[PDB]
Amino acid sequence: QDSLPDTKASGPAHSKEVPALTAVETGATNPLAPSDTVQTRHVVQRRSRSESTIESFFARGACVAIIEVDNEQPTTRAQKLFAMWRITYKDTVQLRRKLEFFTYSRFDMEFTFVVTANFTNANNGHALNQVYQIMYIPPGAPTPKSWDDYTWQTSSNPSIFYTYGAAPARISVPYVGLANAYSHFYDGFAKVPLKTDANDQIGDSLYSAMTVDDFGVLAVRVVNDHNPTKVTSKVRIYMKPKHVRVWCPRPPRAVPYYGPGVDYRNNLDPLSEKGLTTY
Amino acid sequence: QDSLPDTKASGPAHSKEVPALTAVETGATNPLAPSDTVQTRHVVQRRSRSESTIESFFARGACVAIIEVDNEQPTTRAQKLFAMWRITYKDTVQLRRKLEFFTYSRFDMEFTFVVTANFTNANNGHALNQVYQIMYIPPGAPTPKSWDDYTWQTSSNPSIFYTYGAAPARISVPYVGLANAYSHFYDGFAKVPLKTDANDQIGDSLYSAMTVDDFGVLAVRVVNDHNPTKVTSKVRIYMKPKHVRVWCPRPPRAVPYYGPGVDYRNNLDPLSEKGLTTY
Amino acid sequence: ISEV
Amino acid sequence: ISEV
Amino acid sequence: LFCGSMMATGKILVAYAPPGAQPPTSRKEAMLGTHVIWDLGLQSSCTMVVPWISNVTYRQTTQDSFTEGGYISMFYQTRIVVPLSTPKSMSMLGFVSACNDFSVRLLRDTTHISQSA
Amino acid sequence: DKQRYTSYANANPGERGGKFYSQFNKDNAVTSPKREFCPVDYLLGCGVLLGNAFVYPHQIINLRTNNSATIVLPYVNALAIDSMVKHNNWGIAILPLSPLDFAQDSSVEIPITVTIAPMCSEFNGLRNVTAPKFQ
Amino acid sequence: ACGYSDRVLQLTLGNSTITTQEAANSVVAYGRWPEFIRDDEANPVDQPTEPDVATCRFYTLDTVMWGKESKGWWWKLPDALRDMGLFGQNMYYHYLGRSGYTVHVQCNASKFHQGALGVFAIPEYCLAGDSDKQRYTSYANANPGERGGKFYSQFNKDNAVTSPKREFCPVDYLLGCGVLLGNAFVYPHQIINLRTNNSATIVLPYVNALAIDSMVKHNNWGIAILPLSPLDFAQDSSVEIPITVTIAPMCSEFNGLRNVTAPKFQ
Amino acid sequence: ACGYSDRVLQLTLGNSTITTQEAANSVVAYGRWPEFIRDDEANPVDQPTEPDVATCRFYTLDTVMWGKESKGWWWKLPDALRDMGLFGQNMYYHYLGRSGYTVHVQCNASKFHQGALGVFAIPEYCLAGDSDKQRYTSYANANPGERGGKFYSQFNKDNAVTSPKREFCPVDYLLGCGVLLGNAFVYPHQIINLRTNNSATIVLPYVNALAIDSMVKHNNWGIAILPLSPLDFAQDSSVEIPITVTIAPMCSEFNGLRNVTAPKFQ
Amino acid sequence: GAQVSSQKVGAHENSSTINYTTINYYKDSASNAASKQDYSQDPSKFTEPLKDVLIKTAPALN
Amino acid sequence: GAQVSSQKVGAHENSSTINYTTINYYKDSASNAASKQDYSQDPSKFTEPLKDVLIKTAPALN
Ligand SMILES: CCOC(=O)c1ccc(OCCC2CCN(c3ccc(C)nn3)CC2)cc1
Ligand SMILES: CCOC(=O)c1ccc(OCCC2CCN(c3ccc(C)nn3)CC2)cc1
Ligand SMILES: *C(=O)CCCCCCCCCCCCC
Ligand SMILES: *C(=O)CCCCCCCCCCCCC
């Protein structure tokens, strides 16, 4: 049973108990109910808070990235034959705001990949079905310079081999934090400037940033050799936190995000105009 | 065992019991049987009413919508790159008439989506397989203005990612009513005009209508970037009520429907011509 | 199990 | 099995 | 919360009218509904509970006359009285929170945050 | 032509009640619409056939049998309680299944009197009086 | 224990709550809390109406301003409440009605203000009139409703025989009724002494020579508020503070229902 | 019994004692009293230093003056205390250090003064910056020590690309961090309402995603004091009262001793 | 947690109670299929809403 | 190793505790679905962080 407290039949009052009065200076919120300030009937409560549990609130796959990758003839200039994405929930705003209702979090992460593709050019013949390779490159491991170089051999890095048309790719990731909890906010620095330093750049750092590569990257490529005609593709990444726990509540972001930290720039006017005595 | 009452061997009569006579003025229906007005034999009845249970009567997926959506080059004018549909059983007539045999209903709802597509133009090359995104936008949530805008990030709204060619998409929805039952008919208004009102539009409302957006919308888009050649598609929505309960019986609609309320316009002549003494 |  |  | 000086006194009527009638423009009309008469004193603050009185089992979070909640209004029951050498004008702060019977359902995306291309 | 356009004032005649009509005469003037109901008798004023209205709680005043009809009504609604000012729960329809006839006098006329009593009435959410505009 | 006080009260009736942080305990008139007519004291035989929370709640009357020249205010009950929501309706739709009441009188100021209000609850408060004419005060003038009436410092007789005002002439030190004000303390009372308390709370039973009577023909209680000691502040000769009267019906019951009584207050 | 009160407190830590005759009870942040790192939550293996009474005592920071134009003040912890006696020494001689705190904020005035201070204790108080540049605020500007920082009424962007100030721009109604001030009450807090109390006492546990961390690289708690209601007195338009912040370390423990850290605050 | 019940056999093969098995895979009951073992009730509330319900052999109006 | 539990039935078909079955296929617990049987707690640490928590009917400041 998970229903909320029943309402009590409460009656008339003439006493020296004054629950309606309090003092919010103390830091506390008055634990009042209708039966303290008005006559109430007995209501048997069936309503429950089941959808607002920390798990139910986050239990939904959110889009956090769109990785664009092409399969075309390797020419001699800047191309997208392979792509890399620093894993994060911050490129998007929606999940970012929900997780930021809290300072600390601990959870397992589910990743679901929706791959879509299309023809770029009106017509150079067609393409046989493409297989995609998503490789996780943890910090330290060699990053690919070429779409078919040796790093894609993937002997120890986790890789997904997705086939176009198949049900969207899906995997789970454990709680991989270097600490007892993921910090959604870090009031600090990774380096400190010492008086004895040679230049003042040695000890300089980005405020609120911790590790440089934080969790690593996802590298994406079409394993297929190029067709005559080009195929452009998009790997959409959906993120869902499961087996979730959260600490220290924070106010929701009220102005538009300006980068990874708490920085604001514009649209600092969130509230509407409404008259004091207007309903 | 669910068979109907057996027939009784009944015999000749000469009595002061007159079951054949009654008085329908009272409001009641005479509970008679063949054995009351004629000599009957003993029949052991095996027949049952299993198909006419409220569940069996509704246990069928009915087409309630056809959502047309295109995937083409985003040009600068009115297009169908994404579509929205206010969820309802009233765009269609068939299920609408069955559910309307009753005033109140309570059930869980199953939605099955049949997606079909085709080529519009004789030939501009072809298209790689399309993935469809059906997002439920509950009232209050932001409605998309663009086919690839931020609302489709879908962090908390339920979304379906369907792949063309796959078995039709299917999901279940709980009893989501704001009341203890869905009202198939509401003899009332959402607002009341008060004497003290400034204009007489303030308190004006649509008769028999309750909430403005009632249950929200389904937004549909092709997640694929546009091919050179255009692909038009149709998402057919099938609705089936399950775990069904119904209250207060109503007469079936006898004239063609004219909008969401009980309004009639034409073809008010439902009955055929047949002679009084003609078989 | 549960047999009816 | 394990029934709660 | 009365944030006036300690020498300032006053009595205030704060009210809630369940929906369906004219939204109150006068204390006389506001009197008639659910209300608290706050007296300013050592206990700096006063709580008014808006009791769940509704036709539907759950109201909606967006605006809609069919599931509307009613009206909140406040009036002087007497007036703010100060002595001399005392500021004649001061601030009142207001706070809101849900009681323990309160619940919410059908998770959705908020209109309060967005993103441009 | 307008759907669900009948005004609160016209939907609610109070004590005076409303009447049925024998056929659908459409309110034609788009400029200043009457915003009234057009209840056609054999369609029960609601798009279904009158012969089936007997699935609803009823009695028949057959003049050779009885002076009256007594129907007791529970509160029926999809909610335990609602706004009585915004919403009607029950409707009372009295249609002559068989026409009034007497001796040979072609303009016969007898009174029909409706007497109603509230039962188990309970009220919630008290505040100032609602003054609707019936104009 | 905890920290409770004689001066800090909460009155809760129906959907209405009053808080006072500076009261002077509370008076229960003649030691009797309001109650319903008992079967052995019953007289009309018809089943009564008991509207409970819809009529037994706190109605706040229009505020009066106390100033240096203020001589006094008076109201009659049930008259003061004749137009108060569902109470007034029940009162006028029935021949018979009884009621008890909680009277809560409000007057706040500052540690530097000064003055004392005498709040008096009187059974059968018969006032004196205008004229040479005895018992000539008209129903319309006897009953001011919510607006109440005022006291005067001396007897100025309504002189015009031709078109008489038919009003009351309530002289303050004679309690408007021929006796001396200093003795009004034999009646249920409290004092709003501005250095001591913001308010007065008198609870009233139904008092009458009958179990129930016509509320439209007869007032049971009268509320008299006379300044025993004048309003004074700093040195500002035209000081002025609000006095607010809030009243609640209690244990209200009605007998003899029929069509509504429409009195002529013109 | 005897006569004890919610408003009269004595805080005694080490050789320091604070008395308040007008407090508003006291807050224990998130319901957790400060404690030492348990063996089953331990991570550095070296024997810790626990200076007890020599570091866990009341350090009073430089006083700030609240006036009619005052927009707000903010400090970070341990930063505010980096130079406070033996605490600062222990903090800079060790790589690792944890600490809880008792924050005691002081603001007195008179029954005739008016105003309300919002005293806020925030976990991980990340502030917004100067520029177009993201996460560009320098260590030197992020950490004012005892001096603390101030809030502003609006976002005036540091415009000079050539020689950037690399400072914070904390806008008051956005809590200097992109959210609205009215919601800061979800954080551990008290209100200094001048008609009610001279002070606020918030006790703070060590809050962090680690059992222990670098105090020199990272602040755990931020103290934000924003006037919810402005200072006002009599009619004198340039009123001014002192706000004094007194902080004490609690359950301080240090790991990883080596040579002293000398940061560049220039 | 498997549910087992008897099918109502219509056309019997030349081979008696035959059973079928059901298992719910989802936590939310809305996700469940329809059990279709539905009980019935009297027409009475509709066919005879009378305060004095009378016996079919006695005069309807007495 | 099958896990069996009661569904919280919302809209009941005209047919009582209905169960659902769960089995984990993977060794790593991160691979598991969400149990969603989540217990709650007091607002207190947040709604009343006080050293002397007082009773709602007594004066807040004594
Ligand atoms: C400090 C703020 O950021 C976070 O809190 C936060 C951000 C991202 C998080 O995701 C976990 C990190 C990685 C670890 C492994 N990973 C993988 C692993 C294998 C594959 C095929 N694909 N992805 C991708 C995600 C977890 C937490
Ligand atoms: C008032 C008359 O209408 C009805 O009675 C009636 C009409 C429609 C009903 O459907 C339930 C409402 C919605 C709620 C959720 N919903 C969803 C939810 C998620 C997805 C992917 N797709 N659809 C779609 C249906 C239920 C009842
Ligand atoms: C009760 O159901 C215990 C017996 C389970 C037998 C094995 C069932 C195998 C399928 C398990 C389904 C899990 C679905 C989430
Ligand atoms: C406990 O689970 C014992 C009962 C198992 C019943 C049969 C389950 C059949 C499916 C086994 C799943 C194996 C997954 C790796």
Count of domains forming chain H: 1
Query: How far away is chain I from the Cα of C1, in angstroms, using its nearest Cα?
Result: 5
Q: Which residues neighbour A228 within 8 Å (Cβ) at sequence distance 6 or greater? A: A73, A124, A125
Angle at H67 between CA H61 and CA H70, to 5 degrees: 80
Distance J7 CA to ligand 4 centre (A): 21
Residue G53 at interface with chain F, using a CB cutoff of 8 Å: yes
Q: Are B105 and B244 in contact (CB under 8 A)?
A: yes
Ligand 3 centroid to I33 CA: how many Å? 16
The candidate with the shortest Cα–Cα distance to E49, out of E98, E116, E91, E10, is E98
Kindly identify which residue of chain G lies nearest to residue F128, measuring between CA atoms. G85
Q: How many domains does chain I contain in total?
A: 1
CA distance F45 to F41: 6
Q: Is the peptide bond before H227 cis (omega within 30 degrees of 0)?
A: no
Contact C1/I5, CB-based, under 8 Å? Answer: no
- With b for 16 or more beta-carbon neighbours within 10 A and e for fewer, the G199-236 pattern comes to bbbbbbbbbeeebbbebbeebbbbbbbbbeeebebeee
Q: Which chains, if any, share at least 3 CB pairs under 8 A with chain G? A: A, E, F, J
> Which residues, 6 or more positions from A173, have their beta carbon under 8 angstroms from its beta carbon?
A108, A109, A110, A111, J30
- Closest Cα to atom 3, ligand 3: which residue? I1
B30/I38 Cβ within 8 A: no
Technique that determined the structure? X-ray
Ligand 3, atom 9, residue with closest C-alpha:
J23
Tell me the residue type at E3: C
* Burial of residue G7, with CB atoms counted within 10 A of its CB: 0-12 exposed, 13-18 middle, 19 or more buried: middle
Q: Compute, in angstroms, the gap from residue A174 CA to the centroid of ligand 1.
A: 9
The neighbouring-strand residues paired with H116 are H193, H229
- How far out from the chain centre does Cα H15 lie? 21
Parent domain of G241? 1-266
Interface of E with H in 27-46 (CB under 8 A): 42, 44
By the 8 A CB rule, do J23 and B187 touch? no
CB B159 within 8 A of CB B193: no
The neighbours of chain J, by the rule of 3 or more Cβ pairs under 8 Å, are: A, B, D, E, G, H, I
Q: What is the dihedral of CA B66, B72, B75, B79, to 10 degrees?
A: 0
Contact between G169 and G155 (Cβ < 8 Å): yes
Q: Are H29 and H202 in contact (CB under 8 A)?
A: yes
Q: Ligand 3: which of I3, I21, I23 to mutate, judged by most atoms within 8 Å of the beta carbon?
A: I23
Domain that holds residue A51: 1-279
How many other C-beta atoms are found inside a 10 Å radius of the C-beta of residue A177?
15
Distance CA H245, CA G173 (A): 61
For chain E, say whether J23 makes contact (Cβ under 8 Å). no
Measured from the Cβ of residue B273, the count of other Cβ atoms closer than 10 Å reads 6
List, in sequence order, the alpha helices (H) in chain H: 85-93, 139-142
CA G139 to centroid of chain Cα atoms: 17
Ligand located closest to J21 CA: 3
Nearest CA to ligand 1 atom 25: A87
- Least CB–CB distance from E108: residue in B141, B148, B180: B141
* CA B136–ligand 2 middle distance (angstroms): 9
Per-residue burial over H76-113, b if 16 or more Cβ lie within 10 Å, else e, is: bbbbbbbebeebbebbbbbbbbbbbbbbbbbbbbeebb
User: What is the chain A residue with the closest CA to G251?
Assistant: A12
Instruction: Show residues of chain E in contact with H234, CB under 8 Å.
Output: 85-87
* Chain centroid offset of residue B3 CA: 31
- Judge: A127–B127 Cβ closer than 8 Å, yes or no: no
J41 lies in which domain range?
1-62
Q: Do F65 and I61 touch (CB under 8 A)?
A: yes
CA max distance for chain B: 90
In this complex, is the C-beta atom of G63 within 8 Å of any C-beta atom belonging to chain E? yes
Work out the minimum CA distance from J60 to partner chain E, whole angstroms.
7
Of B17, B55, B242, which has the smallest distance from its Cβ to I57's Cβ? B17
> What burial class does residue F57 get, using C-beta atoms within 10 Å of its C-beta: 0-12 exposed, 13-18 middle, 19+ buried?
middle
Find the CATH number of the domain harbouring A123. Answer: 2.60.120.20
Q: Is H23 on the interface with E (CB under 8 A)?
A: no
Instruction: Decide: A215 in ligand 1 pocket, CB within 6 A.
Output: yes
Measured from the alpha carbon of residue A170, the closest ligand is 1
Residue of J nearest to D2 (CA): J3
Picking from H36, H103, H77, the residue whose alpha carbon sits closest to that of residue H254 is H36
Residue A244 CB less than 6 A away from ligand 1:
no
In contact, A161 and A191? CB cutoff 8 Å = no
Whether E22 has its CB under 8 Å from any CB of chain A: the answer is: no
Nearest-CB residue to E56 (from F79, F85, F128): F79
Going by beta carbons, is chain B in contact with chain H, meaning 3 or more pairs sit under 8 Å apart? Answer: no
User: Which secondary-structure segment (H or E) carries E36?
Assistant: strand E34-39
Phi, psi of H6 (to 5 degrees): -70, -20
Q: Which residue reads 């709003």 in tokens? A: G192
Residue of the CA atom closest to atom 4 of ligand 2: B182
Q: Best mutation site among A90, A118, A222 for testing chain B: the one with the most B CBs within 10 Å?
A: A118
CB-CB: which of B156, B210, B211 is closest to E109? B156
CB G219 within 8 A of CB G213: no
- Cα separation, B174 vs B188, whole angstroms: 26
How near does any CA of chain A get to the CA of J34, in Å?
6
Residue of F126, H259, G146 lying closest to E20 (CA atoms): F126
3-class state of residue H140 by DSSP: helix
CATH for G120? 2.60.120.20
The response to whether residue I25 sits with its C-beta less than 6 Å from ligand 3 reads yes
Ligand nearest to the CA of B260: 2
For residue A120, give every residue at least 6 positions away whose Cβ sits within 8 Å of its Cβ, in sequence order, or none. A70, A72, A229, A230, A231, A232, B228
E95 touches chain H (CB under 8 A): yes
Q: Which atom of ligand 1 is nearest to the CA of A99?
A: 5
Which is it for strands H94-106 and H240-257: parallel, antiparallel or unpaired?
A: antiparallel
Q: Parallel, antiparallel, or unpaired: how do β-strands G9-13 and H240-257 relate?
A: unpaired
Instruction: Give the residue, by CA position, lying nearest to ligand 1 atom 18.
Output: A136
In angstroms, rounded to a whole number, what is the distance separating the alpha carbons of residues F5 and B263? Answer: 10
8 Å CB contact between G19 and A18: yes
Name the residue in chain B with its Cα closest to that of J9: B174
Contact B25, F61 (CB under 8 A): yes
**H129 CB-side CA count, 13 A:** 25
In angstroms, rounded to a whole number, what is the distance separating the alpha carbons of residues E47 and E69? 19
CA distance H110 to H97: 41
Q: Cα–Cα distance between B58 and B244 in angstroms, integer?
A: 8
With beta carbons under 8 A apart, name residues in chain I contacting B19: 56-57
Q: Per DSSP, which regions of H47-112 are E strands? A: 59-60, 64-67, 73-77, 94-106
Neighbours of chain H (3+ CB pairs under 8 A): A, E, J
Q: Tell which A residues from 32 to 61 touch B, by Cβ distance under 8 Å.
A: 60-61
Domain CATH for J24: 4.10.80.10
> How remote is the CA of residue J1 from the centroid of ligand 4, in Å?
7
Tell me the structure's resolution in angstroms, rounded to a single decimal. Answer: 2.8
**Spatial separation of the C-alpha atoms in residues B106 and B244, rounded to whole Å:** 6
Q: A247 has which bridge partners?
A: A104
Task: Count Cβ–Cβ pairs < 8 Å, chain A vs chain G.
Answer: 48
DSSP string, G197-231: -SEEEEEE----SSSSB-TTT---EEEEEEEEEEE
Q: Of A61, A134, A152, G199, which Cα lies nearest the Cα of E107?
A: A61
Cβ–Cβ of J50/H30 closer than 8 Å?
no
Q: Which chains touch D (3 or more CB pairs under 8 A)?
A: J
